[PDB]
Design a protein around this nucleic acid. Structure first.
Ligand SMILES: [Cl-]
Ligand SMILES: [Cl-]
Ligand SMILES: [Cl-]
Ligand SMILES: [Cl-]
Ligand SMILES: [Mg+2]
Ligand SMILES: [Mg+2]
Ligand SMILES: [Mg+2]
Ligand SMILES: [Mg+2]
Ligand SMILES: [Mg+2]
Ligand SMILES: [Mg+2]
Ligand SMILES: [Mg+2]
Ligand SMILES: [Mg+2]
Ligand SMILES: [Mg+2]
Ligand SMILES: [Mg+2]
Ligand SMILES: [Mg+2]
Ligand SMILES: [Mg+2]
Ligand SMILES: [Mg+2]
Ligand SMILES: [Mg+2]
Ligand SMILES: [Mg+2]
Ligand SMILES: [Mg+2]
Ligand SMILES: [Mg+2]
Ligand SMILES: [Mg+2]
Ligand code: NA
Ligand code: NA
Ligand code: NA
Ligand code: NA
Ligand code: NA
Ligand code: NA
Ligand code: NA
Ligand code: NA
Ligand code: NA
Ligand code: NA
Ligand code: NA
Lengths: 81, 56, 49, 65, 147
RNA sequence: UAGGGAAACGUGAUUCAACCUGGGGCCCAUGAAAAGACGAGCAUGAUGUCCGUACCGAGAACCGACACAGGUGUCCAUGGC
RNA sequence: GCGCUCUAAUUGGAUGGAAGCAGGGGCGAGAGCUCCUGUGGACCGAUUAGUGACGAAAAUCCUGGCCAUAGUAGCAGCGAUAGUCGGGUGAGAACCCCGACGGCCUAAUGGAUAAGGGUUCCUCAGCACUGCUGAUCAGCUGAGGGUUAGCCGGUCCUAAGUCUCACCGCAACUCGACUGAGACGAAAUGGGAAACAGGUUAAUAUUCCUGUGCCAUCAUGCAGUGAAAGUUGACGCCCUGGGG
RNA sequence: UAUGCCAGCUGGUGGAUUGCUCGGCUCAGGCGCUGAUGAAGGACGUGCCAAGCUGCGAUAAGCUGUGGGGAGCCGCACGGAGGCGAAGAACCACAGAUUUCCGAAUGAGAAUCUCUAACAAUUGCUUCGCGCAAUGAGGAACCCCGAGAACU
């Protein structure tokens, strides 16, 4: 079977969202809905997912911008991995 | 209005596209039929003897 | 023109196939491999579909 | 290498599922690093994490889980 | 590319070459023809005056349509090939450079031999496009000799 | 006591695109259909997934072998004299 | 009768330098044979008997390469005649950037977009290639990054019409008209539930952020048990008034 | 003696020639079906770095078992970093696991995606329930049954 999360989309812009909007960007599998992407994240990382935006990239992959609840901290999460 | 150069400029209509069945850019999206493999017309694949010399 | 998720994928692959032959391959192959016999310019060339 | 077949078979249907999810998570973090211009890598490993997972799965099949 | 067509003696002579230069081959023939027998230094002063337009290079072979220049002696047509000339100055700067690094008096050395050769075909690269027209590709040898 | 502006942070008028609503006239021409909406209240909460989205849109990003004097639809038709 | 390919039998040459090539000597009427020097660096003959995709000056012959043409034509002509002086960067500057001065475009040379293109967008590093000259510039070369929506579109509906299945025809079908059922058929520009203001990036933005607002569905609770008749969607061409 | 003619010499351009052959061409012997248990074909993925080709299929140049083989190895591909192998790897043989989407393509639609359980369609048997089955498509030519020219 296919995994929902491929890996962390790490780029300057992704950093901003992380350091500024408490947002973590991911490269996910294209058949994954927002809700699926939501769950998967709250699990592999143990947090509260507030909202998730998706975009099908010109790379053949789907990018997801995930915003964590005010409790959890994006920077603090991404730091460990 | 010449049929040449000046009439080439109106050609911005899409017809033949990548074929879901044979992978060729011969799927006529307006006809929904591949001119190469016959997808959309027949279950059997398009093929004729005249595609090669008679004794070959 | 409005594209579909499938079309968008194919284009994406095409853009990717359109990259140099990694610098190292040159050495690994004693330079017998240098040219990407599949370079496709956006203006000069035409992608299928 | 740092994992074998017999050793994978001397596990219980619950120990493999356990070992499996372990590697995946390890793999996933390996990839995460690479994605972020990772350097403290040892490429011959991210390669293994894939083969091992294959093995654990091949076995979950043979042993009936 | 070329190889020195003439034979020299290392003890009393310097060498210099230009490779695949994209510049008129016809202009080179002229310049060479023109500066042979001159002194590395005389050549430099000459070529710079040409690039200036105070001195014209006699076009004796490739002269179709070329207007007459009063400064040409014994001949009539000539021009001021500044591109080809700037390139001969490079060949000289080099020939005179090697000269001194060998305890010679470069500027005072004689141009015993200088000749241009059309080499053709630039040859595309890996990650590089192709040659537009058929710009000529020139090679040019130079042999400096002690007075 | 949103926002925006360095500041002032106007008031009246005429003619009036948009938009709104009417009356008249013509046909050997009669000027789509269906989904949907209304008809048929309120409060609190929850859900609202999937695909497109860059850029060119032309005397260099389109068709014409070309950075081609050609060709190529729509809206801005109310900026001043 | 001379020459070419390969087979056989018989018999020879070659790293103490074969074939080929360049120049040169001798023989034959000649097809041609042979030798010398240089190059080359590994194969090459003779005689006899065989074999045949076996001999070129020609076919507006084919393919490739090359010369003269020629440093010649073009890089002027278009109702859009466009630049100039300073300075910046740079190995290099008429044309890359800043300022001033002078111009060009007004339904377009401005702004937003459909189709089409497909990464051409932004950034960094490049200039061998591309750019009608040059280039430090670039749509070029390479590597990175970039497109975020309940309320913009698709999606749903039906149009001319199309396909599918059944039925029937045909020698037969990937063919063929009718009937029946189903589906498909509109992204600027048909119908249509719902979004505005400001802010924000190198690059997105009614998508992100701040503020305010609206729509649908469902759950719960209250009301109502009215509920389907009807209205709407929903309409031509010409003239005109009023509101604004 | 300019401009220049003829031949040579040195260098070049060009790629003939001679030599060489990892490819062809032809003959010969052997062998010979695949597919709803979803084929053949295609799309898209998959490598530390990976563009092409090959392989493979989300277990992705591979996983397992048996036999062979053997000190080496990580395809073409000779780099860099790293790794694997005496727990016998690489490599070969047979057998098995995995095997994305489109594709006869079969729930329905669609230019390889999408929408809310499916042998679609036509049949046979029938517990008359898709319950048990069949068909469809491919293949170098060869084969069998129909349709059937014209140049000449
Ligand atoms: Cl020339
Ligand atoms: Cl009235
Ligand atoms: Cl004779
Ligand atoms: Cl849109
Ligand atoms: Mg989106
Ligand atoms: Mg015609
Ligand atoms: Mg790219
Ligand atoms: Mg003249
Ligand atoms: Mg935009
Ligand atoms: Mg033309
Ligand atoms: Mg132009
Ligand atoms: Mg004999
Ligand atoms: Mg003749
Ligand atoms: Mg010719
Ligand atoms: Mg002339
Ligand atoms: Mg003017
Ligand atoms: Mg740009
Ligand atoms: Mg730059
Ligand atoms: Mg429809
Ligand atoms: Mg509409
Ligand atoms: Mg923009
Ligand atoms: Mg289907
Ligand atoms: Na990725
Ligand atoms: Na194009
Ligand atoms: Na002459
Ligand atoms: Na004179
Ligand atoms: Na004179
Ligand atoms: Na210019
Ligand atoms: Na066989
Ligand atoms: Na079946
Ligand atoms: Na590759
Ligand atoms: Na397999
Ligand atoms: Na049944």
């Amino acid at each position: 079977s296919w995994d929902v999360i491929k890996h962390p989309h790490v780029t300057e812009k992704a950093m901003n969202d992380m350091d500024f909007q408490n947002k973590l960007q991911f490269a996910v599998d294209d058949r994954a809905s927002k809700g699926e992407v939501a769950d998967a994240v709250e699990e592999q990382y143990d947090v509260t997912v507030e909202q998730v935006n998706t975009q099908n990239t010109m790379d053949g992959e789907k990018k997801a911008v995930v915003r964590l609840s005010e409790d959890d901290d994006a920077q603090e999460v991404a730091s460990r991995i | 209005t010449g049929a040449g150069t000046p009439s080439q400029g109106k050609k911005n209509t899409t017809t033949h596209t990548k074929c879901r069945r044979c992978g060729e850019k011969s799927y006529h999206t307006k006809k929904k039929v591949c001119s190469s493999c016959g997808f959309g017309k027949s279950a059997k694949r398009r093929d004729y003897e005249w595609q090669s010399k008679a004794g070959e | 023109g409005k594209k579909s998720k499938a079309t968008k994928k194919r284009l994406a692959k095409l853009d990717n196939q359109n990259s140099r032959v990694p610098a190292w391959v040159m050495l690994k192959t004693d330079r017998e491999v240098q040219r990407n016999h599949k370079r496709r310019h956006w203006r000069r060339n035409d992608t299928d579909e | 290498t740092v994992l074998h077949v017999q050793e994978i078979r001397d596990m219980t249907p619950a120990e493999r599922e356990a070992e499996l999810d372990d590697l995946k998570t390890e793999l996933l973090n390996a990839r995460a690093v690479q994605a972020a211009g990772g350097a403290p890598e040892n490429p011959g490993r991210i390669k293994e994490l894939r083969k091992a997972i294959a093995r654990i799965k091949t076995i979950q099949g043979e042993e009936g889980d | 590319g070329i190889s020195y067509s003439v034979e020299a003696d290392p003890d009393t002579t310097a060498k210099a070459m230009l490779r695949e230069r994209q510049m008129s081959f016809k202009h080179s023939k002229a310049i060479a023809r023109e500066i042979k027998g001159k002194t590395a230094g005389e050549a430099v002063d000459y070529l710079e005056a040409v690039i200036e337009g105070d001195q014209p290079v006699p076009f004796k072979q490739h002269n179709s349509g070329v207007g007459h220049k009063s400064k040409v002696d014994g001949w009539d047509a000539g021009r001021y090939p500044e591109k080809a000339s700037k390139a001969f100055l490079d060949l000289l700067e080099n020939a005179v450079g090697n000269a001194d690094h060998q305890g010679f008096d470069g500027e005072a050395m004689t141009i015993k031999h200088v000749a241009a050769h059309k080499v053709g075909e630039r040859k595309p690269r890996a990650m590089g496009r192709a040659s537009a027209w058929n710009s000529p590709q020139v090679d040019v040898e130079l042999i400096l000799e002690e007075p």
